[PDB]
């Protein structure tokens, strides 16, 4: 797919499964329209988030909603999560991989553009 | 102050100066109301963002943002900006320090609560 995610759990040392990922597109109204959405598989990946034809030039926001991801461990009482906002295909057509690393208090998102 | 920022430049290896920081508070309407704002100093810090009395129990969203911050090294542009959304004081009162580490394609944000 043009837009892929790869989430890692730093506390368990393994891909993060079931972490909800939400994507948005900034409409010309300066407003964030809902775009895609899924939940990581046992490999911290989401398959078929969007299509090459659906993912067009635009500002996107990838939110790693982890509010309760560490609920069973009794770890993050401050309910942390993060966003990444990049400009997708302001020069041809490409592929993006938003690689994230999760910890109760720290978030790490790297975009591998290719 | 109750809410402090500490921005580091991973490509230059020094505190990040002049990176815009925008804070938001989630109103009961589920909407983000502008809260505070500034630009990091030569120490990657913002002084007197908000006051102990102004920073109340609520959901905040800190957004770091840059403007051709890497222009000078001759690297590649990639409009990327990140957000952190934590829930403040859901018991008592505290001091938060949102430490961020910038790179052209990667963002690390760590919240030190104390």
From Swiss-Prot, chains A, B:
Location(s), subcellular: Secreted
Superkingdom of source: Eukaryota
Expression (tissue specificity): Detected in serum (at protein level). Detected in liver and choroid plexus.
Post-translational changes noted in the entry: Sulfonation of the reactive cysteine Cys-1 enhances the stability of the native conformation of TTR, avoiding misassembly of the protein leading to amyloid formation.
Species this protein is from: Gallus gallus
Residues that hold L-thyroxine according to the record: 6, 45, 108
Record text on subunit structure and interactions: Homotetramer. Dimer of dimers. In the homotetramer, subunits assemble around a central channel that can accommodate two ligand molecules.
Function: Thyroid hormone-binding protein. Probably transports thyroxine from the bloodstream to the brain.
Lineage: Eukaryota, Metazoa, Chordata, Craniata, Vertebrata
Protein name: Transthyretin
Gene (name only): TTR
UniProt modified residues of type Sulfocysteine: 1
A GO cellular-component term linked to this record: clathrin-coated vesicle
Family under the similarity heading: Belongs to the transthyretin family.
GO BP terms, alphabetized: oocyte growth; protein tetramerization; protein-containing complex assembly; response to virus; retinol metabolic process; thyroid hormone transport
Keywords: Hormone, Secreted, Signal, Sulfation, Thyroid hormone, Transport
Molecular-function GO terms, alphabetical: hormone activity; hormone binding; protein domain specific binding; protein heterodimerization activity; small molecule binding; thyroid hormone binding
